[PDB]
Amino acid sequence: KRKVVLAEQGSFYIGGRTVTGPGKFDPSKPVIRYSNEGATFYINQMYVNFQAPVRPRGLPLVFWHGGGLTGHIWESTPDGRPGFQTLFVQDRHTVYTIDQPGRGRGNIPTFNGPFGQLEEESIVNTVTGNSSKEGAWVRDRLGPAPGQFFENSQFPRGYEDNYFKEMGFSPSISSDEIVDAVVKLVTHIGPCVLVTHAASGVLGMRVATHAKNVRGIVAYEPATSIFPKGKVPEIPPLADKKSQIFPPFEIQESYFKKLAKIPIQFVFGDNIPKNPKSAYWFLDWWRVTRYAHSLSLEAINKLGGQASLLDLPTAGLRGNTHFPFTDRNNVQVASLLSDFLGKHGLDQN
Amino acid sequence: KRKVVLAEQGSFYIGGRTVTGPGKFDPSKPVIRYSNEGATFYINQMYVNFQAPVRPRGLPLVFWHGGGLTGHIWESTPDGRPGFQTLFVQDRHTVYTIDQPGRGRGNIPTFNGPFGQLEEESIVNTVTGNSSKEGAWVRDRLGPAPGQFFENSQFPRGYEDNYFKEMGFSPSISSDEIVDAVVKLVTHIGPCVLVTHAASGVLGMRVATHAKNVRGIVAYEPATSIFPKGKVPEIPPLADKKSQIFPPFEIQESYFKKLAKIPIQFVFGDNIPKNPKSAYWFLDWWRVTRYAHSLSLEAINKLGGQASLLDLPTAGLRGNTHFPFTDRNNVQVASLLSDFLGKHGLDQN
Ligand SMILES: CCOC(=O)c1ccccc1S(=O)(=O)NC(=O)Nc1nc(Cl)cc(OC)n1
Ligand SMILES: COc1cc(Cl)nc(NC(=O)NS(=O)(=O)c2ccccc2C(=O)O)n1
Ligand SMILES: COc1cc(Cl)nc(NC(=O)NS(=O)(=O)c2ccccc2C(=O)O)n1
Ligand SMILES: [Ca+2]
């Protein structure tokens, strides 16, 4: 089960643009100096890895990490078991994994000067934000509070250090430029399936409205909902009566209707409450966010779509976290993804 | 020949520490906020990838990228040919590739606040530095000035954008903490060989003085020379009679002596001038830096060592850049690395 046979593997950079400092470069002057003089910088490019099996069947899969993550989460679980990259090469799909602009091997746009600043232009903000171990613990629903685990947890307990070390900050790159890089990738590889997670959920939906080569989407616990412009349904605030979920993204209806042309599945793990929970902000946040997504999928289906919501507990899988593809039962989670691909013929040539 | 059979592959995080923000975490309060309140942050951890062949022979190889780079440079060349990772898995070595702390999938230590600042504490500097395309062009000796190639160049022309997109800034993480992470990796792996490049040259030498598991070093064009404390020889300034090379790193003789106990090879490419070249700063810089390394290797041999300098043109290979392992003749470069491993018994069990 750890063995993998690759016809080919590799990695490359795609997307991005260039920005430039003032003046001219002189090769006789000291080159190692604090200066943007005569400088050309490549910024906002994306890193892409691929592994291809011998005799691939069906469409390539593009795995797109969630917020603050990298392609590592598709490579291995925190306790060292095979990730979805290995599992789906074994399932005879070519597999692409990316580090989006601003994350991991993607570009972080900084120069000579305060972070993110190229002379007078602010490419990204100098002030950053970042989550904590404690924030990530409850965001990911390991348990209701740091140090605590829900009863039938599929988290790989004992490997907390490995898990939280994989997370980090994102600079303030425009979401337009992240979408642009993946649109370019989808043009490059041809017909494919996007497999997204959390923060890349809404970005993958946006990519699909720009790229007909996206033939299906599976999104693990997407973080932001998407609706036709001006048609966002009423969404309640959280139980604290003061907080709200992420403002839904709105796109013009002519683009939204492209989401009705491909199969789309949103997958949710366990321990999302049915009723308000004022004591546990992130549990309540997930309740209302999942509700918003159910309305988003309904709007897609009313336009002729093929969108569905899969709650892993309804499929017989209990205890999954916000990362079902690295949980202890990730092989069973992968089996459900294979089922989706097979149902729609995305595993056949 | 692109096919690769892996007994196993994966990745993991290792090394690093934690820093903590003020106060306590309350799961009832909004978790997504501009605050380090109650926050634990994992910082300065390293990303590690591994690919193991069936029936490995000899010691595992740890490939360590140069300055501003990532493990991508061992995966593929800019024009998409197999990198040393593939070539040496095919050569029946287990291959580790790393993204060191502060680069790629390694941690970049920043929080909520100005880049690198945790409340009143500066973990890394807010002001960054970075090379340009122009500076990298002449540092890497593609040619004497940006956009110009040496006639004999082994660079994969036409893939310049791909090449420069792989480079980025590094935050001011202490070199001690980078060495510490690799020492911990070497402890985990067991006996191994370090293959370093440019900025990681001096760091790999330091790791070997702390880790008897390092059984050999091959360094491609190391950037900083190393000497016993108080025994730095006379090194001239550059031809401009103003600039100097990087100040040599000095270590205790009792640690320096450990470098005499393992085989060490420094590898240099082509187009490094023999005589002073005041018109081309980085060509002259490489002349004096290579000279300093010659004296460093001499110092190791006078302690009973086996340290050698391989100039690729003397082996019949002409035109190599600062990245010989991604140049057009990188298969021939790899053959010379296999020759070194075989002479010293590092390719047998
Ligand atoms: C006219 C050719 O198209 C391009 O210019 C182009 C476009 C987008 C990304 C990369 C390239 S590229 O060629 O500069 N490089 C690649 O195509 N890279 C690449 N490298 C690997 Cl190792 C694999 C791959 O696709 C599987 N693609
Ligand atoms: C957890 O605690 C904190 C603290 C602070 Cl300051 N910022 C964040 N931001 C995110 O988690 N941003 S997200 O983009 O990864 C994301 C958000 C909601 C739900 C999911 C995700 C996610 O992609 O995993 N989380
Ligand atoms: C090229 O032009 C500029 C401009 C500025 Cl501001 N800073 C740098 N820094 C480096 O290249 N730093 S290095 O660490 O990668 C390195 C240095 C010398 C020789 C080799 C390397 C190297 O690792 O490849 N280069
Ligand atoms: Ca989302």
Residue numbers in the entry:
A (entry chain B), B (entry chain A): 12 to 360
Article excerpt on this structure:
SulE catalyzes the de-esterification of a variety of sulfonylurea herbicides, such as MM, BM, SM, TM, TrM, EM, and CE, to the corresponding herbicidal-inactive parent acid. The structures show that SulE is a dimer with a lid loop in a domain-swapped β-hairpin covering the active site from the opposing monomer.
A clear electron density was also observed for the full CA molecule in the active site of P44R/S209A. Structural comparison showed that CA and CE are well superimposed, indicating that binding the product also induces the conformational change in the structures containing the P44R mutation. The distance between His333 and the substrate is too long to have a direct reaction; therefore, the reason why SulE S209A and P44R/S209A mutants still retain de-esterification activity may be that a water molecule got into the active site and was directly deprotonated by His333 when Ser209 is mutated to alanine, and then as a nucleophile to attack the ester bond of the substrate.
